[PDB]
Structures are given as structure tokens and as C-alpha cells.
Design an enzyme around this catalytic site. Structure first.
Site, PDB file in Angstrom:
ATOM      1  N   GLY A 167       0.832  -1.201   0.000  1.00 11.84           N
ATOM      2  CA  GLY A 167       0.000   0.000   0.000  1.00 11.84           C
ATOM      3  C   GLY A 167       0.864   1.246   0.000  1.00 11.84           C
ATOM      4  O   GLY A 167       1.512   1.551   1.003  1.00 11.84           O
TER       5      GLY A 167
ATOM      6  N   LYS B 141      -2.170   5.860  -4.794  1.00 14.04           N
ATOM      7  CA  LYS B 141      -2.644   5.647  -6.173  1.00 14.04           C
ATOM      8  C   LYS B 141      -1.542   5.693  -7.242  1.00 14.04           C
ATOM      9  O   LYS B 141      -1.604   4.924  -8.203  1.00 14.04           O
ATOM     10  CB  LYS B 141      -3.765   6.637  -6.528  1.00 14.04           C
ATOM     11  CG  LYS B 141      -5.098   6.319  -5.866  1.00 14.04           C
ATOM     12  CD  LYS B 141      -6.127   7.407  -6.135  1.00 14.04           C
ATOM     13  CE  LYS B 141      -7.507   7.019  -5.623  1.00 14.04           C
ATOM     14  NZ  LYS B 141      -8.179   5.994  -6.473  1.00 14.04           N
TER      15      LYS B 141
ATOM     16  N   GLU C 226       3.220   1.407  -8.045  1.00 16.36           N
ATOM     17  CA  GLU C 226       3.228  -0.026  -8.299  1.00 16.36           C
ATOM     18  C   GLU C 226       4.435  -0.594  -7.559  1.00 16.36           C
ATOM     19  O   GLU C 226       5.492  -0.814  -8.150  1.00 16.36           O
ATOM     20  CB  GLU C 226       3.294  -0.326  -9.797  1.00 16.36           C
ATOM     21  CG  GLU C 226       1.967  -0.201 -10.522  1.00 16.36           C
ATOM     22  CD  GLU C 226       2.077  -0.574 -11.990  1.00 16.36           C
ATOM     23  OE1 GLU C 226       1.719  -1.718 -12.347  1.00 16.36           O
ATOM     24  OE2 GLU C 226       2.539   0.269 -12.788  1.00 16.36           O
TER      25      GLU C 226
ATOM     26  N   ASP D  41      11.635  15.550  -2.462  1.00 13.95           N
ATOM     27  CA  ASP D  41      10.354  14.958  -2.104  1.00 13.95           C
ATOM     28  C   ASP D  41      10.463  14.378  -0.714  1.00 13.95           C
ATOM     29  O   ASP D  41       9.987  13.275  -0.452  1.00 13.95           O
ATOM     30  CB  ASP D  41       9.938  13.888  -3.129  1.00 13.95           C
ATOM     31  CG  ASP D  41       8.429  13.578  -3.096  1.00 13.95           C
ATOM     32  OD1 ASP D  41       7.663  14.333  -2.470  1.00 13.95           O
ATOM     33  OD2 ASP D  41       8.004  12.567  -3.693  1.00 13.95           O
TER      34      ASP D  41
END
Ligand SMILES: Brc1cc2nn[nH]c2cc1Br
Ligand SMILES: Brc1cc2nn[nH]c2cc1Br
Ligand SMILES: [Cl-]
Length: 333
Positions: A45, A48, A51, A155
Site C-alpha cells: 500500500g 494511487k 506499483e 520529495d
């Protein structure tokens, strides 16, 4: 005329002194492995746009993590690969183990050392004062390292810090937005997640550096010590700057705009207003007072600066009083 140029205070020219092949990621040739060495166990998890899978290397039965690189410019793929290879074995940097392509699909995937899928976001609102200092210090090791190696992460957020809290281990992950720092280069400002974007990104100042990551770290720290997620809670990129303006004040903001001769987007004209610089005490209440101290506030204050040149470097941050008991305890082990 145009915006005034800026250079990083530290590690300014490290990529210039390297061989070309170190930073010229477009010229990198990848020996692509075979994805049939690996078998995917389950999807992890990661939201969205992910992968990411737990997998097993069937040659040696060893657990790994696989990240399928979603369709994106080939430029981005070599960049993440070259950065991860350059940083391999650095303190608290995730280890790239293999690079493979699916035989049929031809889609590239990265294979990493196994970690548990327990990110910092899940833990970072429940830590002791000591553990905030401990894990902040571990993140700073990774940042000083990648900065020293001529790379900015871009990030830095709780979701990209994987923690094994039982073993007190930390790994900085997702180097897909990371970039090599080159003096004078003008970078894409559409990077990072809204709440962690530095003022340079928000006002469209492109000639930024490693100091971007230190703003992000500051937002993470503020969130943890004040128990406020996110600390700067904007509706959008424009309102994000307004949220910051209400804490840091408009005087330092406008002096920063004038210093670099930044042309402020006209939408800001009405929304920024006029605000004093708020004392940090404003955010302290009974449910967070145990995490807040003079040392923490002094440290936080020196991270959250409009002027990217004024912020602590990663190594300066590591030398702050806030970390003295962590440094002492580390020498004993
Ligand atoms: Br094993 C494996 C199987 C896959 N199916 N689709 N993408 C894949 C990547 C890997 Br690695
Ligand atoms: Br879990 C995990 C997630 C990642 N996203 N990007 N790189 C990653 C490495 C690991 Br390990
Ligand atoms: Cl980019």
C-alpha cells in the site's frame, strides 16, 4: 531585470569535479536483468501513484521490494537509476539491488533491499521527545550524504521515510524526483507534495538547491513537535504560501522577494495580506508541550526560512544543541 542568481552554500561544485559519467544520466547504459529471477508476493500500500510489491528472489529465497516504473520519460528512469547507484551504501539510503525488465511487457522495474512497509507518517504523531530527535538525526545523515554526493531529494516527506521502529532503523526512499545539483541550473518547481513545498517552489524561483530539502525537513519537524498534520495546511499552491505567510510573516517574505528580484504571480497580490511573524509559543498546548523545548524551537526556526541561503545545511543541523543527547548516546554504542 530578471531574477538574481543563487548558488548553494555547501557542496556547490561537487558534480563539476566528478567525471562526466557520474551526473550525465542520459548517457548511462543499463544492463537490464531478468524479472523472472523474482516472483511478486503481494502489492504494498503506497497510494494511487504506486506499483510497489513485496517479492522473493527465487535464486536465493531472499525477500525484496520491487517498484514497477510507471510509464514515464526514459530520461526519468535513468536519472533515478543513476542516483540510486551513486548513493548505494550511503547512510540510511535505500539499497538498489537489481534493475530488470519484464520479458513480455518490456516495462522497467527497480529491485530494492527489503524493508517493512511501515513509513514515518504512521509512527511520527506518537513518538517520545527523544525518538523525534533520534529519527530526525537519522534523516539528516541521509540528507547530508546525498547533498555531499551532489544530489537533492526534492520529495522529503514522512511517506518517503521507511522506519523499522523495533530495530530503530530508517531508510530514505523514492528517489524518483531527485536531481543532481549544478550551479546556475534552473529547475522544475513542480516537485514535492503541496504541504512540504519550499517558498522557492511556490513563488517560482527556479535556481534552488539542497536547501529545498531542509525546508521539507522543517515542515516534518513542526508537524511532529506540535502534533499538527500538516503544519502548513494549504488548499492549493497559492494558499500554501498564505499559510506560511501567517506564521513566518509578510516582512521577511517581501524582503526575500526583493532580494532575489522575484516576479510574484499576480494572484498573490490580494491573498498574502499583511501578517506579523508569530512566536512559536502560539502553537504549544497541553497535548504537545512534552515534545516542545527551547532547543526544538531554536532548531525549527533555523530550518523554516523563506531565504533558502539562510537555512541550516544538513551538517549544521546535525551540530545543533537539540541533538546533543543523541550524539552523546551514539558515541556510547
Ligand atoms: Br516478477 C514481475 C512480474 C511482473 N508482472 N508485471 N510486472 C512485473 C514485474 C515483475 Br519484477
Ligand atoms: Br517500500 C519502497 C518504496 C519505494 N518507492 N520508491 N522507491 C522505493 C523503495 C522502497 Br524499499
Ligand atoms: Cl524534474
Amino acid at each position: 531585470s530578471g531574477p538574481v542568481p543563487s548558488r548553494a552554500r555547501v557542496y556547490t561544485d561537487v558534480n563539476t569535479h566528478r567525471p562526466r559519467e557520474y551526473w550525465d544520466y542520459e548517457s548511462h547504459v543499463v544492463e537490464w536483468g531478468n524479472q523472472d529471477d523474482y516472483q511478486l508476493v503481494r502489492k504494498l500500500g503506497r497510494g494511487k501513484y504506486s506499483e510497489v510489491f513485496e517479492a522473493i528472489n527465487i535464486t536465493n529465497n531472499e525477500k525484496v521490494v520491487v517498484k514497477i516504473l510507471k510509464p514515464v520519460k526514459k530520461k526519468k528512469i535513468k536519472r533515478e537509476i543513476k542516483i540510486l547507484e551513486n548513493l548505494r551504501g550511503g547512510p540510511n539510503i535505500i539499497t538498489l539491488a537489481d534493475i530488470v525488465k519484464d520479458p513480455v511487457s518490456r516495462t522497467p522495474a527497480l529491485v530494492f533491499e527489503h524493508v517493512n512497509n511501515t513509513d514515518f507518517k504512521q509512527l511520527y504523531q506518537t513518538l517520545t521527545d527523544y525518538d523525534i530527535r533520534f529519527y530526525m538525526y537519522e534523516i539528516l545523515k541521509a540528507l547530508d550524504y546525498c547533498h555531499s554526493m551532489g544530489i537533492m531529494h526534492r520529495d522529503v516527506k514522512p511517506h518517503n521515510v521507511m522506519i523499522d521502529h523495533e530495530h530503530r532503523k530508517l531508510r530514505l526512499i523514492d528517489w524518483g524526483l531527485a536531481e543532481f545539483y549544478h550551479p546556475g541550473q534552473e529547475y522544475n518547481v513542480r516537485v514535492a507534495s503541496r504541504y512540504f513545498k519550499g517558498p522557492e517552489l511556490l513563488v517560482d524561483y527556479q535556481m534552488y538547491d539542497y536547501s529545498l530539502d531542509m525546508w521539507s525537513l522543517g515542515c516534518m519537524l513542526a508537524s511532529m513537535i506540535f502534533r499538527k498534520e500538516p503544519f502548513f495546511h494549504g488548499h492549493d499552491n497559492y494558499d500554501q504560501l498564505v499559510r506560511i505567510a501567517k506564521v513566518l510573516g509578510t516582512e521577511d517574505l517581501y524582503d526575500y522577494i526583493d532580494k532575489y528580484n522575484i516576479e510574484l504571480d499576480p494572484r498573490f497580490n490580494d491573498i498574502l495580506g499583511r501578517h506579523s511573524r508569530k512566536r512559536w509559543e502560539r502553537f504549544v498546548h497541553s497535548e504537545n508541550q512534552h515534545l516542545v523545548s527551547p532547543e526544538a524551537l531554536d532548531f525549527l526556526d533555523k530550518l523554516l526560512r523563506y531565504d533558502h541561503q539562510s537555512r541550516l545545511t544538513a551538517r549544521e543541523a546535525m551540530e545543533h544543541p537539540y541533538f546533543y543527547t543523541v550524539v552523546k548516546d551514539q558515541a556510547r554504542m
